[PDB]
Amino acid sequence: FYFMNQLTYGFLLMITLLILFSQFFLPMILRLYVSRLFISKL
Amino acid sequence: LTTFSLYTIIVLLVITSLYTLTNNNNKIIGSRWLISQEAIYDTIMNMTKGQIGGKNWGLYFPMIFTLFMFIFIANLISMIPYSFALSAHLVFIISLSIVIWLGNTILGLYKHGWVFFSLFVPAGTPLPLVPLLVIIETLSYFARAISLGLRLGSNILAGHLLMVILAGLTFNFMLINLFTLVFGFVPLAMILAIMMLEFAIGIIQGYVWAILTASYLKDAVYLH
Amino acid sequence: DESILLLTFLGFTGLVAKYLAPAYKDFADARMKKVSDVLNASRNKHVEAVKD
Amino acid sequence: KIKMQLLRTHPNNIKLSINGIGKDAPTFQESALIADKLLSVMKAGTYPKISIFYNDPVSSLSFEPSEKPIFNAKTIEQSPSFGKFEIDTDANVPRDLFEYTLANQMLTAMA
Amino acid sequence: MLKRFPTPILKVYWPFFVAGAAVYYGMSKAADLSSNT
Amino acid sequence: SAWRKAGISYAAYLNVAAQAIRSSLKTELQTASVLNRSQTDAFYTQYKNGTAASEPTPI
Amino acid sequence: MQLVLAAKYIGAGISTIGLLGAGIGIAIVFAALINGVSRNPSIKDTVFPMAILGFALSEATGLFCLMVSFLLLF
Amino acid sequence: MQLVLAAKYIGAGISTIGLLGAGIGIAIVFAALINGVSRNPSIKDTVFPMAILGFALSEATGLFCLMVSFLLLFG
Amino acid sequence: MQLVLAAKYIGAGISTIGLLGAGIGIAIVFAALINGVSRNPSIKDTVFPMAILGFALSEATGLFCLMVSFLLLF
Amino acid sequence: SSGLKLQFALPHETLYSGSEVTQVNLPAKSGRIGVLANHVPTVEQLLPGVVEVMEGSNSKKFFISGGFATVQPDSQLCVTAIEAFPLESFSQENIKNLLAEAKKNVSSSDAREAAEAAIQVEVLENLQSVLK
Amino acid sequence: LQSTLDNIQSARPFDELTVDDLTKIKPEIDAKVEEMVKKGKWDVPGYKDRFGNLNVM
């Protein structure tokens, strides 16, 4: 019955997580990497 | 309203609960709740660098992360007993796999056009079996598609249902005569080991998903 | 019925709080002390590079 | 000459003395034959540690007495860098490589 | 909160969204053809 | 065949191989250098703990 | 009609031993893993996930067969 | 209904030798264990926990066999 | 009901041949035991307890199998 | 690197020393092994047989009286043996058979002589492959 | 340089500095991070030597 329900809300969360992780949650850690290496290299 | 859509809400709330409240005020030192996603970042980084090996390899490094974490989180939620099946809907997971495989095909066909079907001749062969290796590659070309989802959720359909039925076994173990209370501990430790294996069928199955689609992205972007 | 599974989960979390959390404590502490050590040592090193 | 040195000061230690060497530059036959005589009558395989003392010409007007150790075959499996090399378990390769090491090290010592 | 970075999601990840739309429309055909069971 | 069990050690095994290849030499090119390689004149005297002696045997 | 549920139950019976391929399979991987670390102790991290990775490849295939039992069980 | 539990009992009979890979499986792991301590004497403290890893969730698969043979017997 | 005890009996028949794998397995254990002690005389009764340990709780599977055969008689 | 560094060594004269090479073929206890550019680090005792050295040029064929092949982990293969051999000149059946029957006669003597006699029997019957 | 030494002695909050303050003291930080995401070189070179990869594999 609820293939549309599970599928549509899952795809909406898929688009949400892709754009979300990409814009926020990966480069917020990459800033930690670049900051640590920029302190260590000076 | 859907309890499964509520489960997706719980997924997004825990994903907020992995970085935001984790980060003690944007500190360099990288505290104990942040070491988790630090190690996850590095074990996906060192994975897909050496997997696809592209000069432009990190461009698909986001998606392999977000295809991992959804499967990594949705197989740490139904581990709690009083829950409903999240990842055990094979329709949804195999639908996701079909989306992934078809996106791989569209990506490679836009990159290569006609020569994307150069994958069907992998290695040198004599003449009379050149198309045969094509055929059961084409027969394996959508077998690449269908099995990948049909693995994992069917694991999870074998996962939690297992912890259903054996619970009923221990429910049908302890309503016969009182001598069932003596040395009736080893089914409890057996279902304990079942949950031990169930964390494996969450975590390592998610990493299996990630590593196989890493190989699939390498084959789809670069021709052999 | 399903309370047996939560009982197994309570025993498992008792084993986790017995066994895993001090090991992850030692692991995170070792990584933390190593990062703080190298991060402080680079600063003291280029302090002495200024002093040179 | 080193026999008449060490027999004068320690006649209890010396158990074998090779004589008849320095008439030519020695070949592999003599050194290999002495390598067989060490493992036929002296039983060097029981010995944990073996050292060869040779005379090392650093240059023409300089010289050197030098120690050169001989690792026995039991030690080779105890080597931290040993399992990198694929060796057989079914061919006794340390049990022969030890004798070959003794052969060429004593040949380098003589020549 | 979290510093927003404009990371390329549309000029990189179009075909998987395209395939998601295609599977949604094929699922429309399926759940209009196989919901009379 | 069981020379490791019955006969020679491995260096001596290849030494007997060396004398066999030098014995099956071409008699045109069996030079004086190869015959120098097979000139065994070393003598061994197994001294004892009391600085005793055996006779010098040609190895 | 009185047979089809009994037939599904014997079908759950015959569909069981396919986890035998699991029972052999993961075995040799750990066997190889011991031979992975016996002759080379300082490479074990290299193979410590890479063995167990294949574990989840084989285990799940064993965990194929009996869930095909279970939906044949129901 | 005179036949269904009988067929369940024979189904539990044929669902019994699926733990065949139990009786081989864990055993041959120990085989390499006896190899691994043989050709490497100072590795035992290394190998036996990992090996008992390769014990436990290698034999529990065989447990699956008899729990099928326990449930189709009873439930 | 005259059929079901006969089915129990032939079920006890088919639930018996699982000792195949235990008999092969403990044999492979002793096989690697002899092959590991012949290449290592110095370490024999350090390993032999762990060998008989793996022997014992490898044969416990076939023990479980024939007691399942006994209760399927019952 | 591509190719291989070969270091062939004899107690009187080392023939090759750091030469770049493509293929070597050499007799070990596990059988006749060919080694190419990279290889597993491996120590192979060398039964007396034939070693063939193929380069960018052709393959030179040697009879060899035994020794050790050793693959240094930077893919540098060294061979440490005793005797060299030309194309075919150094061996003749008149010296082989007439001595070989005497060696088989020595193989029925006392033990130390008979063992070395049997070794020389095996080496001459290996030289029969060079007779080819 | 004496003033830099005196500033260096009293202003090292080395276990509690915020990376937002590092972005505030260097827009080179955000410039390299943003260019690194735009090119996609998610590998940070020169990092693994002094700072461990720390992962499971």
UniProtKB/Swiss-Prot annotation, chain A:
Species of provenance: Saccharomyces cerevisiae (strain ATCC 204508 / S288c)
Chain ranges passing through the membrane: 7-26
A molecular function (GO) term: proton transmembrane transporter activity
The keyword Mitochondrion appears for this protein: yes
Lineage: Eukaryota, Fungi, Dikarya, Ascomycota, Saccharomycotina
Assembly behavior: F-type ATPases have 2 components, CF(1) - the catalytic core - and CF(0) - the membrane proton channel. In yeast, the dimeric form of ATP synthase consists of 17 polypeptides: alpha, beta, gamma, delta, epsilon, 4 (B), 5 (OSCP), 6 (A), 8, 9 (C), d, E (Tim11), f, g, h, i/j and k.
Biological role: Mitochondrial membrane ATP synthase (F(1)F(0) ATP synthase or Complex V) produces ATP from ADP in the presence of a proton gradient across the membrane which is generated by electron transport complexes of the respiratory chain. F-type ATPases consist of two structural domains, F(1) - containing the extramembraneous catalytic core and F(0) - containing the membrane proton channel, linked together by a central stalk and a peripheral stalk. During catalysis, ATP synthesis in the catalytic domain of F(1) is coupled via a rotary mechanism of the central stalk subunits to proton translocation.
Topology in the lipid bilayer: Single-pass membrane protein
GO BP annotations listed: proton motive force-driven ATP synthesis
Name of this protein: ATP synthase protein 8
Keyword Membrane appears in the UniProt entry: yes
Pfam families hit by this protein: Fun_ATP-synt_8
One GO CC term, this protein: proton-transporting ATP synthase complex
Family: Belongs to the ATPase protein 8 family.
Localization, UniProt: Mitochondrion membrane
UniProtKB/Swiss-Prot annotation, chain C:
Subcellular location: Mitochondrion; Mitochondrion inner membrane
Leader peptide range in chain numbering: none
Membrane-crossing segments per the record: none
Top-level lineage group: Eukaryota
Family of this protein: Belongs to the eukaryotic ATPase B chain family.
Note: Present with 12900 molecules/cell in log phase SD medium.
Subunit-level organization: F-type ATPases have 2 components, CF(1) - the catalytic core - and CF(0) - the membrane proton channel. In yeast, the dimeric form of ATP synthase consists of 17 polypeptides: alpha, beta, gamma, delta, epsilon, 4 (B), 5 (OSCP), 6 (A), 8, 9 (C), d, E (Tim11), f, g, h, i/j and k.
Described purpose of this protein according to its UniProt entry: Mitochondrial membrane ATP synthase (F(1)F(0) ATP synthase or Complex V) produces ATP from ADP in the presence of a proton gradient across the membrane which is generated by electron transport complexes of the respiratory chain. F-type ATPases consist of two structural domains, F(1) - containing the extramembraneous catalytic core, and F(0) - containing the membrane proton channel, linked together by a central stalk and a peripheral stalk. During catalysis, ATP synthesis in the catalytic domain of F(1) is coupled via a rotary mechanism of the central stalk subunits to proton translocation.
Name of the molecule in the record: ATP synthase subunit 4, mitochondrial
Organism: Saccharomyces cerevisiae (strain ATCC 204508 / S288c)
Curated annotation (Swiss-Prot), chain D:
Biological processes annotated in GO: proton motive force-driven ATP synthesis
Record localization: Mitochondrion; Mitochondrion inner membrane
Entry GO terms, CC: mitochondrial inner membrane; mitochondrion; proton-transporting ATP synthase complex
Keyword flag Ion transport: yes
Primary localisation category: mitochondrion
Gene Ontology molecular function: any one: proton-transporting ATP synthase activity, rotational mechanism
Keywords assigned: ATP synthesis, CF(1), Hydrogen ion transport, Ion transport, Membrane, Mitochondrion, Mitochondrion inner membrane, Transit peptide, Transport
Other information: Present with 28100 molecules/cell in log phase SD medium. PubMed:12898710 reports two tandemly repeated copies of ATP3 (ATP3a and ATP3b) on the right arm of chromosome II in several laboratory strains, including S288c. This has not been confirmed by the yeast genome sequencing project.
Family per similarity comment: Belongs to the ATPase gamma chain family.
Subunit structure: F-type ATPases have 2 components, CF(1) - the catalytic core - and CF(0) - the membrane proton channel. CF(1) has five subunits: alpha(3), beta(3), gamma(1), delta(1), epsilon(1). CF(0) has three main subunits: a, b and c.
Protein's name in the database: ATP synthase subunit gamma, mitochondrial
Full protein: residues contained: 146 to 256 of 311
Swiss-Prot record, chain J:
Residues passing through the membrane, by range: none
Gene Ontology molecular function, alphabetical: proton-transporting ATP synthase activity, rotational mechanism
Biological process (GO), any one: proton motive force-driven ATP synthesis
Subcellular location: Mitochondrion; Mitochondrion inner membrane
DNA-binding recorded as keyword: no
UniProt KW NAD keyword: no
Keyword entries, A-Z: ATP synthesis, CF(1), Hydrogen ion transport, Ion transport, Membrane, Mitochondrion, Mitochondrion inner membrane, Transit peptide, Transport
Domain of life: Eukaryota
GO cellular component, one term: proton-transporting ATP synthase complex
Main location: mitochondrion
Assembly notes: F-type ATPases have 2 components, CF(1) - the catalytic core - and CF(0) - the membrane proton channel. CF(1) has five subunits: alpha(3), beta(3), gamma(1), delta(1), epsilon(1). CF(0) has three main subunits: a, b and c.
Job of this protein: Mitochondrial membrane ATP synthase (F(1)F(0) ATP synthase or Complex V) produces ATP from ADP in the presence of a proton gradient across the membrane which is generated by electron transport complexes of the respiratory chain. F-type ATPases consist of two structural domains, F(1) - containing the extramembraneous catalytic core, and F(0) - containing the membrane proton channel, linked together by a central stalk and a peripheral stalk. During catalysis, ATP turnover in the catalytic domain of F(1) is coupled via a rotary mechanism of the central stalk subunits to proton translocation.
Protein family per UniProt: Belongs to the ATPase epsilon chain family.
Gene: ATP16
